Design a protein around this ligand. Structure first.
Ligand SMILES: *[C@@H]1O[C@H](CO)[C@@H](O[C@@H]2O[C@H](CO)[C@@H](O[C@H]3O[C@H](CO)[C@@H](O)[C@H](O)[C@@H]3O)[C@H](O)[C@H]2NC(C)=O)[C@H](O)[C@H]1NC(C)=O
Ligand SMILES: *[C@@H]1O[C@H](CO)[C@@H](O[C@@H]2O[C@H](CO)[C@@H](O[C@H]3O[C@H](CO)[C@@H](O)[C@H](O)[C@@H]3O)[C@H](O)[C@H]2NC(C)=O)[C@H](O)[C@H]1NC(C)=O
Ligand SMILES: *[C@@H]1O[C@H](CO)[C@@H](O[C@@H]2O[C@H](CO)[C@@H](O[C@H]3O[C@H](CO)[C@@H](O)[C@H](O)[C@@H]3O)[C@H](O)[C@H]2NC(C)=O)[C@H](O)[C@H]1NC(C)=O
Ligand SMILES: *[C@@H]1O[C@H](CO[C@@H]2O[C@@H](C)[C@@H](O)[C@@H](O)[C@@H]2O)[C@@H](O[C@@H]2O[C@H](CO)[C@@H](O)[C@H](O)[C@H]2NC(C)=O)[C@H](O)[C@H]1NC(C)=O
Ligand SMILES: *[C@@H]1O[C@H](CO)[C@@H](O[C@@H]2O[C@H](CO)[C@@H](O)[C@H](O)[C@H]2NC(C)=O)[C@H](O)[C@H]1NC(C)=O
Ligand SMILES: *[C@@H]1O[C@H](CO)[C@@H](O[C@@H]2O[C@H](CO)[C@@H](O)[C@H](O)[C@H]2NC(C)=O)[C@H](O)[C@H]1NC(C)=O
Ligand SMILES: *[C@@H]1O[C@H](CO)[C@@H](O[C@@H]2O[C@H](CO)[C@@H](O)[C@H](O)[C@H]2NC(C)=O)[C@H](O)[C@H]1NC(C)=O
Ligand SMILES: *[C@@H]1O[C@H](CO)[C@@H](O)[C@H](O)[C@H]1NC(C)=O
Ligand SMILES: *[C@@H]1O[C@H](CO)[C@@H](O)[C@H](O)[C@H]1NC(C)=O
Ligand SMILES: *[C@@H]1O[C@H](CO)[C@@H](O)[C@H](O)[C@H]1NC(C)=O
Ligand SMILES: *[C@@H]1O[C@H](CO)[C@@H](O)[C@H](O)[C@H]1NC(C)=O
Lengths: 240, 316, 40, 46
């Protein structure tokens, strides 16, 4: 487990050391803030209808009463530019907050806790995660149990041993096709079908697909051991 | 899950067959390119949203040729191969119970994923769901018999798994009858689809409002451009024209702002739908009122026009 | 010898789950996976 | 004693009630004791 984990921390380090573009999700934020600021600067060149876009070149070409007609223009289009930008930025601010609320929720439910949510903490069964700083972002290294080597088995929903129907307490009944076992729901580790691994309810007429096998009792060899012990002491006590 | 994609030629909206209108539009600088960018940033988000809601598996799981699901008759929601579309029966209602300009530079280009491709993803999500239980959401698809999957579900809601097997004929009958009440209710009313028919009507009415603004005077003597350039002289018709450039550019900016604000709500809807896909389909949620009403057992995703529809299955 | 190709998008690897009314695929080994996720 | 489990004395749990709790060891120890008892009665005869 540790060697696999260490190899996986290795792989993430080698990945981000090798490739160009995994953080695209963060670079497109910094790119959009730059590109919108630049567009807001470009609009300083727009005439918007005026004889010139350079504010001072108007004031050094026209008088107080006629220049006001050109300047009103530039004031109109630059104010339209700023309202365009502040609307576009307020919309982003709502996206970035929605992103930050998700990031706080993942910090809370994946770093400060273990989550049962499917793939909320990356695609596997969630074990834990480690947060990392990134410029204007967070990066989560999610650590996950992922099932690998599958094997097929026959199974049945219940077992019959004495007309009564048995069910796993935890896990499932399995057979390799010769013998019947019970094992946990996520990892093959078979066990003998004992009355301590199982519980009983009702009778074999109702359970569709039920099958027959012996259900073992750990009190049976104990009691049997007492028998042999007792039968010896009764054979013995014939003699005197 | 999405709105329609859209692109407008800002020039063909503001102007059209008039070079001197474009020579006036250029006097306002970069706005038109910024508008086109802005709608492209919506349009890209629509295919991203649809792909994050539906593409949550990297394998297509075919549903097996023999339907021995212990008595659960999924045939209402599994795909029917005998039809030209590979939609399910229930989703071929959804595809109809929702119902649905190029002359003005507006273009309503298609989505990336087609409806027959979304049908295949929702097929694989459902087919994995009934054949594999939840395991394909975490690792490989691992088969288990459906009445043992339901036994695990029951264990999940804290109900001991004999309660399934002692009642299996009843539980499948209750289920099968309940998939009937869905079928018939969707056959009965439009008022169930309203969350989708709304976002379809609203994106349509937004384009239709942007078009009608072309006819507005904005204080110019006419909205017909050829009136203005024929009847009046070059230097006073320029003053009549800047009114139309300015009013029409405000109209496009109103549409683009409105579309961004909408697309922010559709995103939120898509991120919810993607979360319900992961936690209700690819699993069994422990969250109250998340995967429907009751205690959650499983859910089945269906396609709908621009949307996803979940059949949540719950114990009450 | 390079050129642009255009194609209908594969949805994924196509697969059929080996289902039967009595068959199960209990996993017998695992890999601990560490996956990066990035948020603004 | 396989569906329940035991802790502390009945004076601390506000609202507790009285009933017998069955133990599945007991009737097997008993059905052994009657069989063993017979082994003793029969073994009085030699
Ligand atoms: C299915 O799994 C079974 C459990 O692993 C396996 O049965 C076991 O097989 C071994 C031999 O490989 C037996 O070994 C014992 O056999 C007798 C018992 O009296 C002795 O002579 C031997 O010295 C040795 O102790 C196990 O007893 C046996 N286990 C059980 C529960 O019977 C099957 O062979 C497996 N079948 C397949 C198809 O894989
Ligand atoms: C699981 O193990 C059970 C016990 O070995 C077995 O149950 C037995 O099934 C047979 C055939 O259905 C019954 O046979 C008798 O049926 C009537 C009386 O019930 C007589 O007229 C017949 O002549 C015949 O004697 C047994 O009565 C029945 N016994 C019990 C204890 O239920 C199941 O068939 C086994 N199933 C499998 C698949 O292994
Ligand atoms: C539940 O079962 C309890 C066990 O049998 C029973 O407790 C017993 O209650 C009586 C009456 O309160 C006590 O009687 C003694 O009370 C005082 C001494 O404390 C004396 O005046 C009496 O003569 C007598 O000795 C028992 O001592 C007490 N048992 C124990 C172990 O203390 C409860 O009363 C039962 N409750 C119900 C509602 O069934
Ligand atoms: C588990 O078994 C299934 C099929 O059942 C097996 O069928 C025989 C081949 C034999 O091995 C029996 O004892 C089994 O009961 C496997 O599915 C087959 O996989 C192959 C490729 O390996 C594929 O070409 C077939 O089309 C599949 N057949 C069916 C009916 O699905 C499955 O791969 C096995 N899984 C594991 C993890 O062992
Ligand atoms: C699953 O249930 C559907 C009905 O909900 C069954 O389809 C009907 O089957 C009968 C007999 O073939 C036909 O007469 C009906 O016209 C069918 N109705 C529809 C809507 O197709 C289907 O046969 C059932 N399948 C199983 C395996 O039980
Ligand atoms: C549990 O409730 C179900 C119905 O929700 C009951 O099933 C019905 O039983 C009556 C006879 O008592 C029949 O008329 C119906 O046709 C049955 N419906 C179905 C869907 O099977 C059932 O009897 C109840 N069980 C218990 C133990 O109370
Ligand atoms: C479980 O899988 C791991 C690898 O993911 C197996 O470990 C390898 O074992 C072989 C020998 O069997 C070695 O050659 C490799 O170098 C091992 N890798 C590591 C990381 O140690 C392991 O054998 C498998 N266990 C079981 C029970 O199948
Ligand atoms: C399992 O399916 C086979 C047909 O493939 C059938 O003969 C058998 O009776 C079924 N068993 C159960 C318990 O459903
Ligand atoms: C009989 O049992 C006693 C112990 O109870 C032991 O000392 C004695 O050697 C035994 N003798 C025989 C013949 O078994
Ligand atoms: C329950 O309420 C009744 C009064 O209605 C009271 O006599 C009794 O002591 C209460 N029992 C507990 C366990 O509080
Ligand atoms: C009584 O004890 C003898 C051995 O001394 C034994 O053979 C017989 O089976 C016993 N009978 C009973 C009824 O226990």
């Amino acid at each position: 487990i540790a060697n696999q984990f260490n190899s996986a921390i290795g792989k993430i380090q080698d990945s981000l050391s090798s490739t160009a573009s995994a953080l695209g999700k963060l670079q497109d934020v910094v790119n959009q803030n730059a590109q919108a600021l630049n567009t807001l600067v470009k609009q300083l060149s727009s005439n918007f209808g005026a004889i010139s876009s350079v504010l001072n070149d108007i004031l050094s070409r026209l008088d107080k009463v006629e220049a006001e007609v050109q300047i009103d223009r530039l004031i109109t289009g630059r104010l339209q530019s700023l309202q365009t930008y502040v609307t576009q930025q307020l919309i982003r601010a709502a996206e970035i907050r929605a992103s930050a609320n998700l990031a706080a929720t993942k910090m809370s439910e994946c770093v400060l806790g273990q989550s049962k949510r499917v793939d909320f903490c990356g695609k596997g069964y969630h074990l834990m995660s480690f947060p990392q700083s990134a410029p204007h972002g967070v990066v989560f290294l999610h650590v996950t149990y992922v099932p690998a080597q599958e094997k097929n088995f026959t199974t049945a929903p219940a077992i019959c041993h004495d007309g009564k129907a048995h069910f796993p307490r935890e896990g499932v009944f399995v057979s390799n096709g010769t013998d019947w076992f019970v094992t946990q729901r996520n990892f093959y580790e078979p066990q003998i079908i004992t009355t301590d691994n199982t519980f009983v309810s009702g009778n074999c007429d109702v359970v569709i697909g039920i099958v027959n096998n012996t259900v073992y009792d750990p009190l049976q060899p104990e009691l049997d051991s007492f028998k042999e012990e007792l039968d010896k002491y009764f054979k013995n006590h014939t003699s005197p | 899950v999405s709105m329609t994609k859209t692109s407008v030629d800002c020039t063909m909206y503001i102007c059209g067959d008039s070079t001197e209108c474009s020579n006036l539009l250029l006097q306002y600088g970069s706005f038109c390119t910024q508008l086109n960018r802005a709608l492209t940033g919506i349009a890209v988000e629509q295919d991203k949203n649809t792909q994050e809601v539906f593409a949550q598996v990297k394998q297509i799981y075919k549903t097996p040729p023999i339907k021995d699901f212990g008595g659960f008759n999924f045939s209402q929601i599994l795909p029917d191969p005998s039809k030209p579309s590979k939609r399910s029966f229930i989703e071929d209602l959804l595809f109809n119970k929702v119902t649905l300009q190029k002359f003005n530079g507006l273009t309503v280009l298609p989505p990336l994923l087609t409806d027959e491709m979304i049908a295949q993803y929702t097929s694989a999500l459902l087919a994995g769901t009934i054949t594999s239980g939840w395991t394909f959401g975490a690792g490989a698809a691992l088969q288990i018999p459906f009445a043992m999957q339901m036994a695990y579900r029951f264990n999940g809601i804290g109900v001991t798994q004999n309660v399934l097997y002692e009642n299996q004929k009843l539980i499948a009958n209750q289920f099968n009858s309940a998939i009937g009440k869905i079928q018939d209710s969707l056959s009965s009313t439009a008022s169930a689809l309203g969350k989708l028919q709304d976002v379809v009507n609203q994106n349509a009415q937004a384009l239709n409002t942007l078009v009608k603004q072309l006819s507005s005077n904005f204080g110019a003597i006419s909205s017909v451009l050829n009136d203005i350039l024929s009847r009046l002289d070059k230097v006073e018709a320029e003053v009549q024209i800047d009114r139309l450039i300015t009013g029409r550019l405000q109209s496009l900016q109103t549409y683009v702002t409105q579309q961004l604000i909408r697309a922010a709500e559709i995103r939120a809807s898509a991120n919810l739908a993607a979360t319900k896909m992961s936690e209700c389909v690819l699993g069994q949620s422990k969250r109250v009122d998340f995967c429907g009403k009751g205690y959650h057992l499983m859910s089945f995703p269906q396609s709908a026009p621009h949307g996803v529809v979940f059949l949540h299955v719950t114990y009450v | 010898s390079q050129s642009i190709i255009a194609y209908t998008m594969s949805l994924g690897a196509e697969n059929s789950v080996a289902y039967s009314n009595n068959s199960i695929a209990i996993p017998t080994n695992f890999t601990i996976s560490v996956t990066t996720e990035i948020l603004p």
